[PDB]
Amino acid sequence: LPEHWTDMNHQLFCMVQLEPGQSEYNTIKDKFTRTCSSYAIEKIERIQNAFLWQSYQVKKRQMDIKNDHKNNERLLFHGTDADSVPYVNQHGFNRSCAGKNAVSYGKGTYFAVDASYSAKDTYSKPDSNGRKHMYVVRVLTGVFTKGRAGLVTPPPKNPHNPTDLFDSVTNNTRSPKLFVVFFDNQAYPEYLITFTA
């Protein structure tokens, strides 16, 4: 488990509230405000989930071996409804629970490059107290191609070798604005931003 995490005392899960003025808080706030300057952050919590971390780090090591000298990991945003937050915190991102996206590049979990995309009410639905929720997520994007609405897994790199797959898909390979992942433990929810208008 990462050495800067708070001691959990044999606990496998906890949320840690970050302090404004710490570099850890301030970098997430800057990443968010770059495209969401009109919203205000209530708090940022570090997600310490031992089991999700273990499974994710195993998948990362495998993709680092398979792809050899690629930047396989991106830090991306995911807006969700309050009713989903307890499940994501404990179990991560389940494609079986994902909605149809307004522009579908496949049936998977969607992650945004820009916080502004995730900040739409359609993804970060305001709760009964006007709080919006967005995860900051380590995503194994690996080698990616433009997706298509029919995909249930990423497409093959070569049609004559149907099982050798891209790691993820995007809307545009030249200027990616979203990524779609189709497998469990390909994304680690690292921070939860609670924010308001």
Report the partner that residue 110 touches, choosing among ligand 8BW, a second copy, none (CB closer than 5 to 8 A by kind).
ligand 8BW
Residue list 127-166, contact with a second copy (CB under 8 A): 152-153, 162-163, 165
**186 part of the interface to ligand 8BW, by CB under 6 A:** no
Rounded CA-CA distance 3/14 in Å is 15
Query: Quick one: what does residue 99 bind among a second copy, ligand 8BW, none, with the CB cut-off 5 to 8 Å set by partner type?
Result: none
Give the shortest CB-49-to-ligand 8BW separation in angstroms.
19
Find all residues with CB under 8 Å of 132, minimum gap 6, and list them: 39, 79, 119, 121, 124, 125, 126, 194, 195, 196
What lies within 8 Å, CB to CB, of 128 at 6+ separation is none
d(Cα 123, Cα 134) in Å, to the nearest integer?
Answer: 9
Q: Please say which residue, 52 or 193, places its beta carbon nearer to ligand 8BW.
A: 193
User: Which residues of this protein are in contact with ligand 8BW, per CB under 6 A?
Assistant: 77-79, 101-102, 104-105, 110, 112, 117-118, 123, 178
